[PDB]
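Input for the complex:
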Amino acid sequence: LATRAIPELTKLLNDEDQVVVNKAAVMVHQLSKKEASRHAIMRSPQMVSAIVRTMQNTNDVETARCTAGTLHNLSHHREGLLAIFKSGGIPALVKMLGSPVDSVLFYAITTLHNLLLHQEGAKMAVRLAGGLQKMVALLNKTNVKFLAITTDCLQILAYGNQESKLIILASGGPQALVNIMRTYTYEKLLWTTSRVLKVLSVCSSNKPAIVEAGGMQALGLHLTDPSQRLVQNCLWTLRNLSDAATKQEGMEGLLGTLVQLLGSDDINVVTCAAGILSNLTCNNYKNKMMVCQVGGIEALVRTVLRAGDREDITEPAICALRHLTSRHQEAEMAQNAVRLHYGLPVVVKLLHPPSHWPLIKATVGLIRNLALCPANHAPLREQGAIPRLVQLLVRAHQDTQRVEGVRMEEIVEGCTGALHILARDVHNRIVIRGLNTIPLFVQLLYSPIENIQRVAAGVLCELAQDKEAAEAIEAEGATAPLTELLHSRNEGVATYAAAVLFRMSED
Amino acid sequence: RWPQLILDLHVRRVW
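Predicted:
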């Protein structure tokens, strides 16, 4: 009997008189709580279609909310979602997002959210209907719960779809999402808002836009928050944005928090914390100072020890040290701290196996920076940091005469470059020259690369200040190539190469 | 609690 009224009500919804259409909409609205009448409207394509057309057309808000609410109730069942879907439900609902009447707006956004969640093919529908831009524009509202629903939709849509990301990007999404993170305290909201940003951060072109809005800073306010899922999202997001944001201001609090995050028991948080700092201290002196000033050096040291064999933690940690140990005020203070905190012995052990190139690559560079400090010369030597360092240079030079993501050329460079600084100490020169390094120190001058030549002359510059060393060089035949590098257009290569021959001139 | 209602019963349904 109930199935006989439906084909009648349909007729009524289509009626012209907006006095009875309201009535029809009201009765239909009431026939949404009954498991029978619902499954009767639901299973009637002409009925559901009639409702959708009415909703978006009947400008009488009292009717628009009855119809919208009706569809809202159909979005709890698979057959309901399907009816809504195949009846052009999405495009209409998307259009209803422009309704100035909150009751209507809430029905739409909510139902849409259900559709996206459980109805397959709903994502394209919202995308095609200009839903992305309309949602991003709705990030102006101050309703924490409404924002939570809207931000989750965007995430669902943006996940796996590059175009959606580019769209959100162009819609000013980054600026809006950032404001939520730095305005609202509602966890659910903040959490789902981060998930959105996480999805956006993987996109190269989306990355900068986020950093400009002040994403780095905003994400750092919640690294302390109780919510595990919230923190674990800001870490993954920052580890993505990090490499880019080497120009930002007011990063202290963040840098500081990242430092003490290196202490968390959760090894996974320590991993991100280090990976992030490694990128923020890269060619950024202000970030290097800030880190050292909050005891960053000491922390990273502990991190390395606490890591151990696992190169997943040591790699980012070492790079961060490699950074903090040069080109700023507390550069010296940093080189001392690494020694003072008993980090020298362990670092050398990192050159030796079973370590890999990506690790060895960073370790050598750090040793170079640690050699700058005079009070590190002796300690480093004692740890056999010379025999093993050159040992790796020999194995690195053979592989270029005849990997793991690292080219052997720059490995050959890092070795010699470190030995340069690590030759200011007299005792060091003795060991260096006592391991027959001169013969191959000359072949480095025949290197096509300007970098290899630049350090190949600097090391011999330190060795040349001796007598028993200046002769072994000329006896090998290095007196000729040195004369050639005098003209090298490279500003650096032409500086040491000149001082080398000179040292052999005034004995 | 209107029309806030609408969002609150929905949140419960999902989150």
